[PDB]
Design a protein around this ligand. Structure first.
Ligand SMILES: [Ca+2]
Lengths: 285, 285
């Protein structure tokens, strides 16, 4: 019933074309929204770090420990930088890649809807035109034949007593002649059909196969954008990402309790210089 | 100038204020951790909304076959990365914030007024150890004045004597007193100078000992803090987590699985020329 081969069902193939352009928008929007997220995460890391740096040194912490604590903001900065890069990449590489591909692939007609869709609809319409026509011709004939066959059954039931009369057998005559004429036309229409079906199928097939090629360029491309995105999202394939954590561990393992204690001593404790009491002659001078 | 030396009276107060500072620092660390946890949570949350959103528009859109799966797979990464930022959030709050919170609670005990019991204990250790030296320090300043002043006066009497060009005897006995006064007060000033010198070593020993108790208390806080900074570091470190890499390994595997020709073959039987057809035949009665 809903077979591609029944009149008009090619439309489902045509509509895939249109769809193809929406899916590009879809994917571009998607990538955009993802970038907005990577960026917000990034920007909030930046804020937090700035703030903590200011707080930390505007506060009482001193020494190597101050530095280790400080070291944590430095990962916040480095990790913020990484997300910004991701955002930048999606936007300047991915979005652009899809935008560029789409505008070269789908050409807008000033009427509206795409030149490519139109081209495909026309081609199918053309391929199916003669064929759709015989179809209408055949059914008419099949029906005429069936009608004739019915009338004859009737005349026959009619002969099977009682009231010159000769007009009745002259009806069963006219009806066997109708069956014949009618059967003949039905058969010839059937024949032209069988004669034009190999060509109908070659024509549909060429159009179909062009549309398949066109969706193939799209799908193969899509698969490629998808890997690109995955490559841009994956911090784990960026050698930098482990550096940020090694560098922090170091800054932290580098802190020394006993180094700081001893600084304090010389800076605010017993380690500081003293002018011990000495005698003073009275000169007022 | 050693006006600020810790060895001057009252100047131990910098070591005392350091105790109070540690509590405050503990608070700062907790505030810092929480705020970072909140950034982790938000990025996670934003990822799950995104994944929800696009999971749905993908389902309802015209994208089908193995490509819909590959595109869809990206929503799974958003979700799993999201789940990983939530573990970072929870480790920070439930292990790290909690660990500092506890330690603080067992180290600083608020008193009724209330300062911290640990501060008061040091204020008093210092008071106690500085008591004799503080005393001897005001015996000296006094002794010194009594001397300076008595010299100043001697010059004065001598001066009237010069300015004199009976009672002239009441003016040279007036130098005679002022000479005895310079003697007696210099003896005092000198005997005190000797005491402070002599008892300087025990002033220092006392002080150095209270200060050592302070150092040890700070040491405990410093060693705690480094253990903590390391804890924060492990919890933040997705760059060396198994599951992080794995989400991208799975993502790549899903994307690579997608196969254009297959999708196309599918489309062809399903909606194309490969679909089943009932071609016209001769039809009876
Ligand atoms: Ca879908």
């Amino acid at each position: 019933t809903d077979s591609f081969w029944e009149v008009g069902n090619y439309k489902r193939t045509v509509k895939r074309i249109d769809d193809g352009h929406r899916l590009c928008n879809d994917l571009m929007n998607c990538v955009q929204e993802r970038a907005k997220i990577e960026k917000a995460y990034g920007q909030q890391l930046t804020d937090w770090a700035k703030r903590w740096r200011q707080l930390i040194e505007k506060g009482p912490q001193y020494g190597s420990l101050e530095r280790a604590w400080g070291a944590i903001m430095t990962e916040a900065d480095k990790v913020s930088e990484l997300h910004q890069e991701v955002k930048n990449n999606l936007l300047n590489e991915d979005l652009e890649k899809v935008k560029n591909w789409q505008k070269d692939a789908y050409h807008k007609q000033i009427m509206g809807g795409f030149k490519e869709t139109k081209e495909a609809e026309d081609g199918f319409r053309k391929a199916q035109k003669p064929w759709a026509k015989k179809m209408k011709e055949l059914e008419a004939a099949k029906k005429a034949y069936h009608l004739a066959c019915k009338e004859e059954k009737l005349a026959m039931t009619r002969e099977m007593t009682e009231v010159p009369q000769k007009k009745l057998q002259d009806k069963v005559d006219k009806c066997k002649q109708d069956v014949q004429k009618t059967q003949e036309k039905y058969e010839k229409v059937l024949e032209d059909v069988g004669k034009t079906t190999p060509q109908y199928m070659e024509n549909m097939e060429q159009v179909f196969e062009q549309c398949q090629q066109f969706e193939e360029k799209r799908l193969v491309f899509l698969k490629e954008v998808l890997l690109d995105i995955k490559r841009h999202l994956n911090l784990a394939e960026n050698s930098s990402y482990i550096h940020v954590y090694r560098e922090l561990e170091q800054a932290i393992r580098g802190a020394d309790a006993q180094e700081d204690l001893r600084w304090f001593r010389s800076t605010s404790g017993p380690g500081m210089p003293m002018n011990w009491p000495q005698f003073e002659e009275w000169n007022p001078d």
